[PDB]
Amino acid sequence: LRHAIEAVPSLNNPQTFSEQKLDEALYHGAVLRVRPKAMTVAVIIAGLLPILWGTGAGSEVMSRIAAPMIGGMITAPLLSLFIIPAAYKLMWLHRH
Amino acid sequence: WIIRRSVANRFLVLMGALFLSIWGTWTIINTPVDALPDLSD
Amino acid sequence: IAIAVGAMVDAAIVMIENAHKRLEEWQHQHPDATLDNKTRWQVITDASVEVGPALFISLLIITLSFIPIFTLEGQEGRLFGPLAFTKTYAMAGAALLAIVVIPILMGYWLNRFLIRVYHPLLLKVLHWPKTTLLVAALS
């Protein structure tokens, strides 16, 4: 989001106001997050999932140390996808 | 910064990780084992 | 090392991914049947230009925001001691390797349909987005 508002569309934004121009700038930093993001979230949870299953010696403690991360990796990404943008479009309007 | 100086070390970096790979593989094969770390006072 | 594996591969991929689209822009701005071993060199190392800091400092974050764990005293500190150590060394390795080898090895060697489920709600989030920061608060 920062480099979207630091590229060539960021010549228009700091110069003059066009919410429809900064929105378009957030929609690409939006589709460009999905590819690396949806995978980052997938690789974190997919690789963290085996230990969540608790059959075997030592599973008990590792599955307890895991759940918080796996659970926290559903709401962290899911939410931060909408919380970061809607707070950066809103904080960019104050200075402006 | 460092992403610049790195590309130059193109060749030997590979061999460093070549020996490192066979070095880290030798140790793992020869590492002691236990159920848990010693937790006693 | 087990808990950490999900993040080491995370170091390389976000870097490789920005390169996959940076190599798809040179393809549209330039010809498509002409390219050398150096012309393929510059496009990938230019993917390390942007996210380079973002990730290495993010792994630097993941290994430091964990350090406080080492302050656990006695029996508990002896249990989760070695786990903290290796979770840290594993990252430090993946991090120091995504700057010495990873960028090198990547130059030497239905997304649409999830994108269609997302942006309808994203463009929606820009409706009095404050109302979406309010809904996050109740969570």
> Tokens for B35?
């159920």
CA distance C119 to A14: 25
CA distance C33 to B8: 27
Q: Which amino acid is at C66?
A: F
CA distance A25 to A90: 14
**Which residue among B7, B10, B37 sits closest to C78, beta carbon to beta carbon?**
B37
CA distance C45 to C19: 8
Residue of A83, A77, A71 lying closest to A33 (CA atoms): A77
A77 by DSSP, 3-state: which?
helix
Phi and psi at residue C98, to the nearest 5°: -80, 15
Q: Which amino acid is at C52?
A: G
The beta-strand segments (E) located in A11-53 are none
Sorted by sequence, the CB contacts under 8 Å of residue A46 that are 6+ apart come out as C6
> Tokens for C39?
């012309």
CA distance A68 to A79: 16
**C50–A3 C-beta distance less than 8 A:** yes
CB A85 within 8 A of CB A30: yes
Angle at C109 between CA C98 and CA C87, to 5 degrees: 25
Count CA atoms within 13 Å of residue C107 on its CB side: 25
CA distance A56 to C16: 36
Tokens 């590492």 -> residue: B31
Question: What radius of gyration do chain A's Cα atoms show?
Answer: 19
Farthest CA pair distance, chain C? 65
For residue B15, the chain C residue with the least C-alpha distance is C101
Phi and psi at residue A5, to the nearest 5°: -95, 30
CA distance C95 to C28: 32
Sorted by sequence, the CB contacts under 8 Å of residue A90 that are 6+ apart come out as C129, C130, C133
- The resolution of the experimental structure, rounded to one decimal in Å, is 2.9
Length of chain B (residues):
41
* Residues of C with Cβ-Cβ distance to A69 under 8 angstroms: 3
> Tokens for A75?
């709401």
Farthest CA pair distance, chain B? 51
Residue of C10, A44, C55, C7 lying closest to B2 (CA atoms): C55
**Which stretch of DSSP H or E encloses residue B23?**
helix B10-29
CB B7 within 8 A of CB C103: yes
**B41–C100 C-beta distance less than 8 A:** no
CA distance A54 to A61: 9
